[PDB]
């Protein structure tokens, strides 16, 4: 959603049925991704492909 503006470092994420803070929950061996600019909806949760811009 943050492609349309907001605060990093306070982004939530969606475990089914709830919303919870991203950074605090992220496991020690994993990285998460937050779309800040994407004109053509190329990033999707199951396939984050980034293209020019």
């Amino acid at each position: 959603t943050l492609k349309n503006g907001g605060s990093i470092f306070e982004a939530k994420y969606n475990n089914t049925t709830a919303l919870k803070p991203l950074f605090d929950d992220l496991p020690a061996t994993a990285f998460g991704i937050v779309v800040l600019q994407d004109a053509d909806t190329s990033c999707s949760k199951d396939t984050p492909v980034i293209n020019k811009g």
Partner: protein
């Protein structure tokens, strides 16, 4: 110049995914066959793709 149409998803029974290869030959009654070989790209991102 002529174009052969194949309903791949029906032929192989599923849609071909990303990072997969497909290879073959169109074999005439006599003479050398036309080789076909391509690997589908890593990221589908547009409706018509130039597998070439």
């Amino acid at each position: 110049l002529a174009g052969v149409l194949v309903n791949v998803s029906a032929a192989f029974g599923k849609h071909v995914g990303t990072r997969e290869r497909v290879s073959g030959y169109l074999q005439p009654e006599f003479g050398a066959p036309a080789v076909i070989e391509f690997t589908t790209p890593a990221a589908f991102t547009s409706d018509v793709i130039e597998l070439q």
